[PDB]
């Protein structure tokens, strides 16, 4: 009859930064066709719906873009975990998804969840094999590191820039980027612990994304494989600066390329708004 | 510090139909840069902000897409008027905008505003002069009536189809439509009092719009000029059927082509949700 929701800015501690997600509570009475229509009404990159668990977790989360359901998504799940922390006392939260149960660690101050860390699906990867085409679309001549495409649900391509200023100077041809289907293009630069990223994806319906949580795990793997960090070392990834939505993602990939044991992504989140819908 | 808002589905009486707009109340403390960031956060086609009047109206309304401020907009202003009716008793509402003061008549049942009628800016028009290009993009060979482009703030082109089934069968090339800048393409079919429309606008950031209120006045003028209705006769325009967002717009253009005295557009509206933001 009515549902409460919150809008969480994921990968931010300040409202209007990070990447929004709408989280709808007590959604068991909504058929998925209605969830999809609600996600379309809200028009945020994702709306999530909190449901009773079916396999021993704390809750089952269904994730919708304005057009389709997703089996996994990075910032939407982080924001959902932070939102649900307002309704539980547990330090760990186990959220069921189409792809299995994702474990979260919740960080609180005086009962308010301010951040969370999630274990991500372990990616696979290969060479993109379309380098000249992609580089032309981005407006540059070469990448620093190999142009590889990672799969953990979505697909994320990584193109390296020689400096943060070169990354900020990119002005991609978005029409040309639209020939890259079912993937996002992540451009990065930095050194040591601190990296900057920009993400562009016509395929996922975003000219430039603020905080691509599902790309943070893959980027940590990419940087470790290519010798810029070690496996087991965390990185800080700052995204969305150029578009006025700065977002901080932390990532770490444990093990070795051939036997990854854990891919962790963490971030702050903050409530932008709260409301109730009439169905 | 905090602001209340509502989500109104304009040109509908049932939630999840029509065209959403977010309406923020008591917005005088928000600088326009912050209004723009809020509109971007919400990501609805428009968010509006209710401000104290400056020229004798009931309120001043500022209208933002996720990217820029607009001087006028059809469904956003209808939805704002219906939303503000919850806070006033007056039968008429005078809303100041960048383009002057727009008069609304509010229709209530037991204190709830269920519909409103607005006087629109009087359009101007001319031939598009790009017929072959536009028809190719739409996938058809010819229009029924002359292909003319109307200006009332936005620009709206009208292409006529020989039957409602031919209108539903359109599958436009949206890449080709993107070469039509600063305008929307409205395709229509029908007879007598009852017309169907579909609107496509890469320029205004919408693949297919549910209810193009600023096009309804122009369509009434177009139909009267081309002899399908008389000036002074109202039409019912049903839009958004193919995309699952049916929307009913009523329109009437009084006078004659050379001396239009009033362009009225009316519709139902309904509250989808209500909430509060943290700034
Ligand atoms: N924002 C996203 C989006 O629009 C799409 C996907 C995606 C796409 C294909 C398969 C899949 O499992 C997920 C992921 C995200 C995300 O945030 O991770
Ligand atoms: N949805 C709209 C949109 O995205 C843009 C405009 C527009 C564009 C240019 C000039 C202007 O005055 C208005 C109007 C609307 C609307 O709803 O009427």
From Swiss-Prot, chains A, B:
Keywords: Antibiotic biosynthesis, Isomerase, Virulence
The family this protein is said to belong to: Belongs to the PhzF family.
Active site location: 46
Pathway: Antibiotic biosynthesis; phenazine biosynthesis
Superkingdom to which the source organism belongs: Bacteria
Name the record gives this protein: Trans-2,3-dihydro-3-hydroxyanthranilate isomerase
Subunit structure: Homodimer.
Pfam family, one: PhzC-PhzF
Enzyme Commission number(s) from the entry: 5.3.3.17
Any one GO cellular component localisation term in the record: cytoplasm
